[PDB]
Amino acid sequence: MKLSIILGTRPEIIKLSPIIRALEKTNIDWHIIHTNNMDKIFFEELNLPNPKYNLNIGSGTHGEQTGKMLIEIEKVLLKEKPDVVVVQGDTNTVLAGALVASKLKIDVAHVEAGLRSFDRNMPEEINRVLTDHISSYLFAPTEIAKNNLLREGIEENKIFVVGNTIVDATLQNLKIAEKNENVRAFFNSVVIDDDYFLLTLHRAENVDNKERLKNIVEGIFEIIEIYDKAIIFSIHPRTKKRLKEFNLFDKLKSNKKIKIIEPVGYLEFLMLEKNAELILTDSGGVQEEACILKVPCITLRDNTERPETVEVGANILVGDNKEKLIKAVEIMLNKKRNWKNPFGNGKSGERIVRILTYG
Amino acid sequence: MKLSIILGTRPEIIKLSPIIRALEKTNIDWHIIHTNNMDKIFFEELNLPNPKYNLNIGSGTHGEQTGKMLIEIEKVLLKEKPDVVVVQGDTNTVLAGALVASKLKIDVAHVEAGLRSFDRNMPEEINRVLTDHISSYLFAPTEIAKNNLLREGIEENKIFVVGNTIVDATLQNLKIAEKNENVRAFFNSVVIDDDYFLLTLHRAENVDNKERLKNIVEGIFEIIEIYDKAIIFSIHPRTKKRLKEFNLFDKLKSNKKIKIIEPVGYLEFLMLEKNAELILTDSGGVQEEACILKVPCITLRDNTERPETVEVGANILVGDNKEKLIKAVEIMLNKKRNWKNPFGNGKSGERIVRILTYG
Incomplete structure (x- = not known):
């Protein structure tokens, strides 16, 4: 009923736009927390409503980036009190949002879950792994993805193979570009x-x-x-x-x-x-x-x-x-x-x- | 050669004291980051050297606690540049330290790794899971623990069954109490x-x-x-x-x-x-x-x-x-x-x- 989408990049916005477009054809109460150009123009090229909350995280260290969003995202989720927090991808925003939601006892959904490079050196693989392990809903694109999530002891009933939203997104955005x-x-x-x-x-x-x-x-x-x-x-x-x-x-x-x-x-x-x-x-x-x-x-x-x-x-x-x-x-x-x-x-x-x- | 122990509680200090006592009989360069009584007296009852770094995190929200330590622990690890960060347990300190170290590309060791309540509601179980999945060295107490870490796709060569340091600790601290x-x-x-x-x-x-x-x-x-x-x-x-x-x-x-x-x-x-x-x-x-x-x-x-x-x-x-x-x-x-x-x-x-x- 109340749903909060945390995003910080354009590939994120794209892969999430089909989720946003579906949301406009439901009675669910929902909003976007955008982290950081202040991406207004992009949201408009894609016929997407502007994010209610823009949080400038500014630049600074990895640690402070993550910390400042932990704090800020927290002030929003305390105010908004949603039931689900939805994130896509593997940036520091995604892990921060998932971490906050998890500590506020809010269910988290990971869109396009289960991808692995099995190179636990790039910080993004870690992000992926942590975010998946704190998630209530794992929307895995493929069976292979599900099997990954499965070799990691993640409960099978949390996994939903639903394909990739990049298809929806690419199709829809094409129609929009036309x-x-x-x-x-x-x-x-x-x-x-x-x-x-x-x-x-x-x-x-x-x-x-x-x-x-x-x-x-x-x-x-x-x-x-x-x-x-x-x-x-x-x-x-x-x-x-x-x-x-x-x-x-x-x-x-x-x-x-x-x-x-x-x-x-x-x-x-x-x-x-x-x-x-x-x-x-x-x-x-x-x-x-x-x-x-x-x-x-x-x-x-x-x-x-x-x-x-x-x-x-x-x-x-x-x-x-x-x-x-x-x-x-x-x-x-x-x-x-x-x-x-x-x-x-x-x-x-x-x-x-x-x-x-x-x- | 350079080793950083991040701790924030007394059960932590106890379980880590055998690691500290061994460290004093090696040529390894090591230090403690303590987070928050400023626990001096306790460190002294156990014949333990005072922590080089005490960081008051103060109180505030879950989010800000974690964020303030992300920032502060980061300033220390940037200064100290160790090779391993060692943590024991499952408080917010442990996850914060492990997160920072992981983003600074520092190897992390989890002492007493692999315990599970399989109740992914208490924030501490999550802490345990995340910390384990960002860890290079998993010092699991029992074979059963190892099997847990194993059903979670954690690479077998990262796991070391070495028993629990609570034994060392309880024995040593007894001798000290005598x-x-x-x-x-x-x-x-x-x-x-x-x-x-x-x-x-x-x-x-x-x-x-x-x-x-x-x-x-x-x-x-x-x-x-x-x-x-x-x-x-x-x-x-x-x-x-x-x-x-x-x-x-x-x-x-x-x-x-x-x-x-x-x-x-x-x-x-x-x-x-x-x-x-x-x-x-x-x-x-x-x-x-x-x-x-x-x-x-x-x-x-x-x-x-x-x-x-x-x-x-x-x-x-x-x-x-x-x-x-x-x-x-x-x-x-x-x-x-x-x-x-x-x-x-x-x-x-x-x-x-x-x-x-x-x-």
Whole structure:
């Protein structure tokens, strides 16, 4: 009946927006505690109501960050007295909120629970583990996730496999990006032909290494001269650095079939992803989104942090290789786009809110 | 090589004193962070060096307690830069210290790890679970403890079954209490005969309930008239309340074989325990100490929070019953006192310090 969502980042806001959107179609009394740009503009691009509470934690040490939110989040939860505190992810905000709620005897729900890198060195893995172990509702995305939570002695009746809300989120936010004439402006001001490949490249293992970078660039060229297809390239500062450095950038400015752009925003880039014919990337995020958006994906790495996309057929791993690349492109351009979605059916915000309604 | 012990309570100080005493016989550079009487006098009764750092956390909310120590403990660990942070138990101090150390990338050791009540409602169980899951060294007292830590996916090579330091502690502190003429003064000023039973009674289930209380008092009387043996009775305010209330207290003042005393200190009471012929109690703590001290124990409850003492033969459960009591007394007064110690061999402070030396 009363529900408090504690968040502190944008990937958090995105994955939680389907939970927020479901909440507006229930009679549950709910609110958001945002921690820290004061993210107003972002909440508005996503048609999301502004957070009732913004808490500036300011900067300072790990210890003081966590402590200041423990104190502040506590003053809010003492005032608001909710029944559930919902958190997603693994930042210091998430653990702080979960800790406070747990000490105030408030039930906590962890959205997208059960992921593990089994590298208990990055502070985020710890965050994940602690937060999961103080949680009453564990909304695990996959069975595998559930089994993780299970090898950790976490009571089976606390675990709910409900898929990932990144599916809901990516779908909904896409629809929102479509109705945005400010960004439809931009989209139409870059895309020429009804056919383009969208390419992103950023991993250090690729841009630092002059070899792999040269290789990949030439790969793109072979792809172009074969398929005579426009490539759109959003390019972060680091890459352009490594390209003017390795004497490759000029070759790219040259090729009139390649269209280069300054980096863009969440929704613009969602537009660019949905309407691509295939996507070429090193980012695990982009692999995920393409798979969700039913766009074929080719990955310029040899290992992937989202291997499930390869398992369903949405994704293929070519790494550095130009033959693997040409071969992949052949397969993906003629790919009937109906892979099973390994991340879920796209109704997880609603389902999570239903399960919370039950309790 | 550099070691930081974070503590905030007396049961903590006790269980850690064997670790401290071992440390004084190693070349390891070490210190104590004490959180909050400013416990100086206690550290001195136990022949323990004063804590380098005392941090007043003051009082305030759960959230602010934890936050203020996160901040303060952090300023110390930034200054001291140790390799290991050692904590024992499950207070807010323990979790705070473990959290800070974990975020500063310092290895954490949990002394007496793996205990579970499986009641994830009391904040202390949570504390236990979180602290264990952020720990590099888990010094579990028993195999059972290890199996707990194990059902929680905690890596087997982090677990070290090394027994409980309460054995070391109780033994050492007893020796210390013996050499204390201020308390040997008191001991000799209560004990008359070389034979006495020491009786403690405090549980609500016993003192609130007029029935069970009447029963037990009369039980004591039957025991007296049979064995003609002095009973020493340390009596907290609550009990004397419930005894003058239920018209029983006067009967106790009457019986000249019963000797009644105002409550006493750690070491005085350790003296009273060691030199008893048998001990009669409802406290799980006292059961533990008696078992460690090789003194037969009779427990006036029907269930015990330290059942292992019954398993080795040191302890028998009579509850309310006067026949069970008479029968127990018969068995215990003729008990060859060599039960296996279910808590460990009494060398755990040293062993823990050895294992920390290895790392």
